[PDB]
Design a protein around this ligand. Structure first.
Ligand SMILES: O=C(NCCO)[C@H](CCOC(c1ccccc1)(c1ccccc1)c1ccccc1)Cn1ccc(=O)[nH]c1=O
Ligand SMILES: O=C(NCCO)[C@H](CCOC(c1ccccc1)(c1ccccc1)c1ccccc1)Cn1ccc(=O)[nH]c1=O
Ligand SMILES: O=C(NCCO)[C@H](CCOC(c1ccccc1)(c1ccccc1)c1ccccc1)Cn1ccc(=O)[nH]c1=O
Lengths: 145, 123, 136
């Protein structure tokens, strides 16, 4: 599956240009937290990941999945919607709905990795950074803006 | 991915006559979920899938705004299952939570992630 | 999808010899603390063959009646992986919770959703992590 990713700021583009953390094989592509943020106790926060994305599998545009990373387990953070379903047609900012199950506020930091994108096939993924997803303003393409 | 769905009462029939990767399922009767609880919510339907195949029950994205969570994370509905479809919902709140006929909390989805089609059926 | 499973002790081998989703056993009695996440070791390593493929660890439906929930929602096991399989279990109760040898809380499933088979095998490949090769 091939992901095309629009970074919504230069600071995000800088994090994905220097990705680190993804290799040959890998069924999941880790996404970054892009800004320090405090999640309230006993709350759901809708955390914006600073990117938009489409997946391609003669080419079709496909739905894909947003999984928690394994290592989220050691934190009190849980993915509210279990596994996120990103539809083929979605062009908005990718967002993680994180339940803070603790009674203390929880600090997430720029460069933390809590979730990863995954293909319905389970096959290795690759990605490239792109200026737009399609011609629409929401896809960040087309005349003007 | 094609579903043949059997509705269980006529008023559920009506709901599904009156409707991309997932097919939203309706809450079929008003119900109060106790605080800190897990409730098995019957969805008024049985269903098979043709592509005879297994399929998945995901929470809908919008469940996140509520304090309800699917207890078994993602439901796995085996090719062999003929029973009514049931969502196990935890209410993570200290308060009761009311769910209404027509609420959409849960969706069916195929292992391929390809857009889904259904027909109502009676057997 | 075909799974090749190494049991990490003879006791575990006995359980899998006498056995869509393939259910995995709890292999030792253990007490989960209240309000906790525990990495429960399942005493097996496993590979899925189609060549090697990624696969998924779901909770079983019946986990819903307990207070135990899978902390990472659905586990993703990469094609590589040769480590012991672990279930990350949240005990959402304020009492300790007893799991027992033979309980079934979790299951392996394919990304295809195809029915699966397994055989018990002595090594996954030649490496030590695969339980293979010289010295084993
Ligand atoms: O299609 C969408 N949005 C359209 C723009 O609104 C989805 C997310 C649905 O948006 C949520 C939301 C919508 C309605 C009620 C409650 C929440 C959302 C839900 C769950 C996870 C992530 C996002 C949303 C939209 C905008 C701001 C905050 C939340 C995209 N999506 C789906 C799963 C997901 O995990 N992340 C994500 O971005
Ligand atoms: O085979 C099933 N049901 C009836 C046959 O026994 C499955 C789910 C298992 O049934 C539960 C249950 C079984 C054993 C202990 C506790 C609960 C169940 C669990 C989780 C989700 C939904 C249903 C069940 C069966 C009958 C009444 C209430 C719950 C089908 N299934 C699986 C996932 C799911 O999300 N919904 C569902 O209906
Ligand atoms: O690839 C792994 N381990 C390599 C050794 O690190 C996995 C899970 C990541 O390992 C955990 C862990 C790592 C880092 C921080 C916290 C936990 C883990 C997390 C979630 C579920 C199961 C295991 C781990 C590794 C070693 C001992 C205990 C936990 C394998 N995996 C993935 C999903 C899963 O559900 N079960 C599992 O065994």
């Amino acid at each position: 599956m091939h992901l095309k990713i629009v970074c919504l700021s230069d600071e995000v583009r800088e994090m994905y240009k220097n990705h680190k953390t993804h290799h040959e094989g890998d069924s999941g592509l880790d996404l970054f937290i892009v800004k320090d943020e405090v999640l309230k106790p006993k709350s759901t926060t809708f955390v914006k990941l600073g990117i938009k994305a489409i997946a391609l599998q003669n080419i079709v545009n496909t739905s894909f999945l947003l999984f928690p990373r394994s290592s989220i387990s050691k934190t009190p953070l849980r993915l509210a919607n279990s596994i996120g379903l990103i539809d083929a047609g979605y062009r908005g900012e990718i967002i993680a709905a994180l339940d803070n199950t603790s009674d203390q506020e929880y600090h997430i930091k720029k460069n933390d990795k809590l979730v990863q994108l995954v293909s319905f096939t389970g096959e290795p993924l690759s990605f490239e950074l792109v200026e737009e997803l399609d011609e629409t303003s929401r896809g960040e393409g087309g005349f003007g803006s």
